[PDB]
């Protein structure tokens, strides 16, 4: 009952005994009363203020500690708390920051289907104001237009934090597609093509593609492996299945008998 409301959160959180004490704090709130009917009665709305506040700080702790399955877990606890039948409990300022963390995490999961189906609960909070939501929908607009340069010039532009765990997964989900787009029937290119298709002036990153994949830098020349097969000759695979398709016609030109 009112146990460690604001501990070591404003400055640092190096300890892990805070996590179990918050976990015991997550026990006692759910041992008090269930949030399932949720009709009225501002008394039980007081403990809905506290329960949503101790998970938003639990979400900030979860993104700080490099934890992916918990950051979706504490957000799903909060997003089910925003799903209220009789929605009340007036405006918390951490709400617009929280949806920006969820939507950018959903953009980082390579979820383009889930990205757009979330964008209905904000009526006019996408264009007029709310840069926390405006920054991913500007970013997703940049990926659809085709400007990779505009993506990374805005990578050093964040409203609140550094968005560090979000841009690095965003850095991960682009380059493998760029590696997926260059691994084709291409035979060889020089270093200046990887200066344009890829990026920086000889970092350890090109070693990472050299140690994991190929792209062996020899006499200032990369070597990407490539081949092709040949198949117009097989009339035999449309021989068996076409014979099935012709008979199932003639099976069905009769037989309602």
């Amino acid at each position: 009952m009112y146990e460690q409301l604001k501990g070591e959160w404003n400055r640092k959180s190096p300890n892990l005994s805070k996590c179990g004490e918050e976990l015991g704090r997550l026990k006692l709130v759910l041992l008090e009363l269930n949030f399932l009917p949720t009709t009225g009665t501002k008394l039980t709305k007081q403990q809905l203020i506290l329960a949503r506040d101790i998970l938003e700080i639990g979400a900030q702790w979860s993104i700080l500690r490099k934890d992916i399955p918990s950051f979706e877990r504490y957000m799903a606890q909060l997003k089910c708390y925003y799903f209220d039948y009789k929605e009340q409990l007036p405006e918390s300022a951490y709400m617009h920051q929280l949806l920006g963390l969820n939507l950018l995490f959903l953009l980082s999961q390579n979820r383009v289907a889930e990205f757009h189906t979330e964008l209905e609960r904000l009526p006019a909070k996408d264009i007029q104001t709310n840069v926390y939501i405006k920054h991913p929908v500007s970013l997703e607009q940049y990926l659809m237009e085709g400007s990779y340069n505009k993506v990374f010039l805005a990578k050093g532009n964040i409203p609140a934090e550094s968005y560090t765990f979000f841009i690095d997964i965003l850095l991960d989900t682009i380059r493998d597609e760029i590696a997926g787009c260059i691994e084709k029937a291409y035979e060889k290119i020089l270093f200046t093509e990887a200066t344009r298709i890829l990026f920086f002036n000889t970092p350890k990153k090109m070693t990472d593609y050299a140690k994991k994949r190929g792209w062996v830098l020899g006499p200032n020349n990369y070597y990407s492996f490539a081949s092709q097969q040949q198949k117009p000759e097989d009339t035999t695979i449309p021989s068996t299945e076409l014979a099935k398709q012709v008979i199932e016609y003639a099976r069905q030109l009769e037989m309602i008998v």
């Binding site: 117009p232 000759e233 009339t235 016609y249």
Partner: protein
Amino acid sequence: HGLKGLNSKLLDIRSYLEKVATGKLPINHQIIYQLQDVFNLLPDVSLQEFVKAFYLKTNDQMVVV
């Protein structure tokens, strides 16, 4: 039943052939080249003689059905 008599002939060819591949009865050279022009005169469907010309009458007969 046009094909039920086909392999009944083809089982019969190898039955006499394995009888004479063993060597119980003496050979007849007459049946040898009479069998040998069967195998090097069956058609081989490769390119531009069948796979072009087969669809030209298959995509023809799918228009009328």
